[PDB]
From a paper:
One example is the sperm-specific SLC9C1 that belongs to the SLC9 superfamily of cation/proton antiporters, known as Na+/H+ exchangers (NHEs), which are essential for the regulation of intracellular pH, sodium homeostasis and cell volume. The transport domain (TD) is accompanied by a voltage-sensing domain (VSD) and a cyclic-nucleotide binding domain (CNBD), which are regulatory units usually found in voltage-gated cyclic-nucleotide-modulated ion channels, also referred to as CNBD ion channels. In a recent patch-clamp fluorimetry study, the functional integrity of the domains was confirmed for SLC9C1 from the sea urchin Strongylocentrotus purpuratus, termed SpSLC9C1, identifying it as a Na+/H+ exchanger that is activated strictly by hyperpolarization and modulated by cyclic nucleotides (cNMPs). Specifically, SpSLC9C1 adapted to mediate cellular alkalization in sperm only in response to chemoattractant-induced hyperpolarization.
A general observation, evident from the local resolution maps, is that in all of our SpSLC9C1 structures the protein displays substantial structural heterogeneity for most of its domains except for the TD, which indicates that it might be locked. Focused 3D classifications at the dimer level could not resolve the conformational flexibility, which suggests that the movements of the domains are, to a degree, independent within the dimer. Therefore, focused heterogeneity analysis at the protomer level with a mask excluding the TD was performed instead. For the apo dataset, four conformations with a resolution range of 3.2–3.4 Å and with substantially improved densities of all the domains could be distinguished. The most pronounced differences are confined to the region of the CHs.
Numbering used by the authors: 71 to 537, 570 to 706, 725 to 783, 794 to 1012, 1031 to 1195
Amino acid sequence: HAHAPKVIVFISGSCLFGAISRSLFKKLPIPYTVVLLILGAILGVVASNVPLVEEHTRDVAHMDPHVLLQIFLPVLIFESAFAMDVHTFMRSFSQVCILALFGLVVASVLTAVLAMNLFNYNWNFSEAMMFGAIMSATDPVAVVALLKDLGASKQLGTIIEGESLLNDGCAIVIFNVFMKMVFFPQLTSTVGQNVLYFLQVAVAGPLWGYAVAKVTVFFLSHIFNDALVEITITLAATYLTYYIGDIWLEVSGVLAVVVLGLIVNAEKTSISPEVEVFLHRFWEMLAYLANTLIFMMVGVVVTQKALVAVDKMDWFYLIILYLAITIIRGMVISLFSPILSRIGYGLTWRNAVIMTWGGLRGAVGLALALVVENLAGNDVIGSKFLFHTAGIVVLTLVINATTIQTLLRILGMSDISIPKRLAMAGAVRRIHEGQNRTLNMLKSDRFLADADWDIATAACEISDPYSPSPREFADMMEEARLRMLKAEKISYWKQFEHGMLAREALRLLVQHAEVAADEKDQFILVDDLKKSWQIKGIYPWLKRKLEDLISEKKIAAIPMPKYKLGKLMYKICHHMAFEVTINIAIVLNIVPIIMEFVVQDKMASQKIEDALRISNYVFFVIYAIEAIVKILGLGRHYIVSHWNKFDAFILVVALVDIIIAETSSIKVVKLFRLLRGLRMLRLTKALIPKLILVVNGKINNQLSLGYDVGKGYIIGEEEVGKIIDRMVDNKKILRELKHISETGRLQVVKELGLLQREHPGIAVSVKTRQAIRTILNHSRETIHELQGAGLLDEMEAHKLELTVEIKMKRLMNAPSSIPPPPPENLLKNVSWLAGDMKLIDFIKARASLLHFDYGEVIVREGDESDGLFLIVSGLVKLYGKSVFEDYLTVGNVIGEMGVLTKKPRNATVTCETTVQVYFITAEDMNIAIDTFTLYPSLEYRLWRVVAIRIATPLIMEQMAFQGWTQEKVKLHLERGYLVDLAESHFQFNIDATLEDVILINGTAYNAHTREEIRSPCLISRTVHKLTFQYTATEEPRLFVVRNAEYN
């Protein structure tokens, strides 16, 4: 009917035009957005002549400014923020801010002066500043897209993107400031009044955004199965942050959304992964809709209202303006180049050109132009604002956006590095080989013999998109160095693919490897990695100081009252419900404190101020009973704590002012100010624990990243060290490489072991978090394995896989600090004790806790193996000639092999810190071995623990070249078991059911050749059968792993 929404046809039609442009002009260098402007112009000219069409474009063309800003800008700004690589953005935050904020001011002011002097429009400074503001809002989406692939992607790409984000955010702020001075002027403004205005837009805005962000991520972390709720919460937070910010709080909405976008982006872990991928594609779609509409709207109104008021001179000014804003941006970048070069990633002269040429203008500039074109009404200023802004957008998108592709070439930035070319060629060649095998396999199929292979081969063709002498010695060294660093990069990627590394640690390690590859004679330096696990000094100090404030040890020392009258209260005094009730009462006291006092201020409603006085009586009564109960429970010791004395002062205030108030204006203001100022501050007692939790969280986030980088490096080095043994020939080179790897590994394992001592609880939290995450991951795999085998139905598989998903989400809410378990708990958790309560009691009764000081030697080489140590606290350094060094920390048990083979100790143990060890004597272990002999025998368990640790190096060395990482090998061995040579004193291999057989201890004879095999050897696949000697000196033990099919 006549009331039908006519914006539906325009909005939907805009989508179709966007699709058409985006499709047809996909290959041409001209960006599609230019075509949208042409189509908008066509709609404008045709609309002016055909009244029917005008009825459909009017509602959206002639659209109120506020509705333009309130709906579109939050989408554009949030989407831009939500799409950033925050981690890189933060690491270059200063460099972006200097160039964005200060650069924006100078760029706009210089443009403003140009507009005033050059143009004959006779604009004043306010209008010229609006012009400069809308002329300095960039939109480099087309340029960062190219930089994403070709080169210089990591640093340059995000710097231009972040700079554009911040200058867009600030340009709107400047535009808002100067628009009110032009279209909504005010009679007067004081200096102090303006300063408060600055604080609101510049300081309060970001704080409002930060508060809403931290509230949002809190709830998102507590939504477990509703994806729709997560998406809706994101939408509502984004729009309410802007609306409440601009309209109710009058703080800067755009900056609030910028901060909200960045915080929510950083806290992506709080969003379920499946939702995360949705949101990225969702906000992209919303931003794409916003761009398509704004460009078509400009195309419409520019022809209907703007081009009718354009003189020949205006065209001349547009060219001069385009040249000016281009050289101005370059001047700003160069001028700050000395500063920017000394922070973050310094700008090379070629990078500067990219930033200068890549400063495309776009939607935000146009959107703000439409506001002026609307507010100005019939004034020419509106038309000429829209004309120039549209002109600059067209010129930049025609000239800059098309030639940037060639400029990146001329500057020699698009070249693909040799490593990438080689990797792509190898991958393509392997794929090409993979298809030939598949193609042959199909040709043998009876049901596909008649298929047209000429077409099949042509269709499935993947094509490469990119198409002793010192001089001798140094050459191999450079070759080896690069062949090593390349291996590491692989080992990091393998770890990530198997969920062993967080993405951030992977990025750091790969970045360091790449940097080392570019430099000369450079390997990975741990000194560069240290920045990952160095805790900033502020946080430990804050944690210590805050924990001192609520120490309250002087209350814990208070004894029970000496008579029954106080005994009952004392119990209440230590019930959490008491403190919770008092806190709730206090926080409820805000309602009177605000309502009555603000009402009295307004009067300065008498019945309200008369009535609320009674609530003061009620809260006084509550606090009085609280004080009475506390004094009765504690007695004279009550006054000891400083927190209590503050409450005594508060009650003194209550008595004094409630009496005096009931009994000039000074008394009333005294009552109000004193009640408000004091009674709210006693919440800090309950607040401080939350601050401690926040601090823990900040430390945990840093320490966790440290462990990943440190542990990622160690595993990478361990894997590589068994590869270079066969990747390089020259022994001298080989020896030099491994020496560096070990001197790096020792530093990492030491420093990373000292952090645990500095922050015990946080370390335990981090580690238990890793433990759970690993368990769930491999728990997820079995579900896929069961699903893939068809052994479990798809719907049932999904039902299980949900419980894993919610479980992995609840990790993020786990406490940042777990109190370290006491020593007795460690014994309970030793690998070869778990579950055997009878054995645990036997050991716990005979384990003697010892304490050592720095530098003491627990055991020395050649000493008889008198027992084994479990390190419950500290860090010990092992230095054994069978040269070979290591550092062991909490949990690790020393001497497991010694008590079994009864052979002298292999390494000297020195304490790097104050160490505590549970010492179990060899005699006790022998007794335990003799007295605990069920199927999972203690001797069997001990050997199994040792066996795997001995086996893992052998299997790695034998199959490092293949695709298995360490975790896979260790799990692989986990399926194994030790054979009882008493059940059969000879072992017969079965190649179809035994995957690997390892000899751990004792000599074994080849049954046919009667060759003797040394103890730690990995039995070669060629051996058919083994015969074992029987001597007391070395009883032979053997480890085997069967195929999945149980024998």
